[PDB]
UniProtKB/TrEMBL annotation, chains A, B:
Record flagged with keyword Metal-binding: no
Recorded GO CC terms: protein-DNA complex
Full protein stretch here: 86 to 301 of 301
Domain of life: Bacteria
Name of the protein in question: Hydrogen peroxide-inducible genes activator
Organism encoding this protein: Vibrio vulnificus
Length: 213, 213
């Protein structure tokens, strides 16, 4: 018979936005499988506002977000920075000169995600895109289909470095360019409820995530 | 000066579901860039019911769907078949024997997308998963985070072959297994309005897509 028998044990419900989740969480899972093998991560992917509601309502324990976004009343910790690049099709790379000058781009040549995705506000502000006439009026609804439109030669867009590092551009014959701006990156952060009893778990997770960025 | 001056020219608004769009549309863009270089594809990614509403309301021209789903009143053409596999973590591959016998799996060991994603009904029916007690009650909300949970060792799931062929499992230390069933695949199809004047465009696109499957 046998005798019947800690922060990083057990189950955690973690939410993450669509422009992060496919990239960073692959690396996070591989690290915690080894370093914290009793931690089971139930994962939810949703856009920022929906994730915040789920966190406040106790449907999720912790979020991995891009910051800043509205997180009144929550506790957060910034864990690293994720650079922005621009991308254009190799077959349009000639007809667009580098360094990129937005005034030199055609009108309606910049494609962006619908505004429920925080990537659009982060990129437009961090890369100083102030001329709204360069933005195409057709809004993209996923990072993958945004990139596919650029690969079809339709214009250009801003892409986070973690997507590039995880192969998002593979086999799509794209060129990666630096945007304008001295602070062309987004912060990445973990967000949780102040009344949680699991802050030690979240801060240990925070340290793991920071090492992936 | 100069003189002022056809089915596959111009702009097309195409919608596609999240368990297809990241995979197949990369290949489709590369083929049409060469074969139909004047065809500009504006892309929308959304789940099936939302896409059908957008198609009926004239907000999109044509869809690439997994079939069968409800498409009353629309015209459709099946263009190929996309096999299903199961996946498990390499570190759990021992504790699960092959051929897979669902009765031998732990209860709650099968993770599935929320039902707005047609992959769940297609996979459960085509792979003959009849025992509901094997389904984990936590529903996944994206194909990427579904796979990450399996990579974390939490259980198993069904994955379409086009995702595997496009690298979805890379670096996640997963094993690919055959499911039960003689017809473990899903159909892929294009869907459009009967009153459209662009059927010649859609059938030419249909031929291109069939060659990618
Ligand atoms: Cl978001
Ligand atoms: Cl769907």
């Amino acid at each position: 018979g046998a005798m019947e028998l800690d922060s990083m044990q057990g189950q955690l419900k973690l939410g993450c936005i669509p422009t992060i989740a496919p990239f960073l969480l692959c690396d996070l899972v591989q690290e915690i499988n080894q370093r914290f093998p009793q931690l089971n991560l139930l994962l939810r992917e949703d856009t920022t506002t929906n994730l915040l509601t789920a966190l406040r309502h106790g449907e999720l324990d912790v979020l991995i977000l891009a910051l800043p976004v509205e997180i009144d009343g929550m506790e957060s910790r910034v864990v690293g920075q994720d650079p922005f690049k621009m991308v254009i099709s190799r077959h349009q790379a000639g007809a667009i000169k580098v360094p990129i000058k937005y005034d030199d781009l055609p009108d309606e040549s910049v494609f962006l995600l619908e505004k429920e995705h925080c990537l659009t506000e982060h990129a437009v502000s961090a890369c100083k895109l102030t001329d709204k006439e360069k933005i195409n009026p057709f809004s993209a609804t996923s990072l993958h289909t945004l990139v596919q439109m650029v690969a079809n030669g339709l214009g250009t867009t801003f892409i986070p470095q973690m997507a590039i590092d995880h192969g998002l551009l593979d086999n799509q014959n794209l060129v990666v360019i630096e945007p304008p701006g001295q602070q062309a990156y987004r912060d990445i952060g973990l967000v949780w409820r102040p009344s949680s009893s699991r802050s030690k778990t979240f801060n240990q997770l925070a340290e793991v995530v920071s090492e992936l960025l």
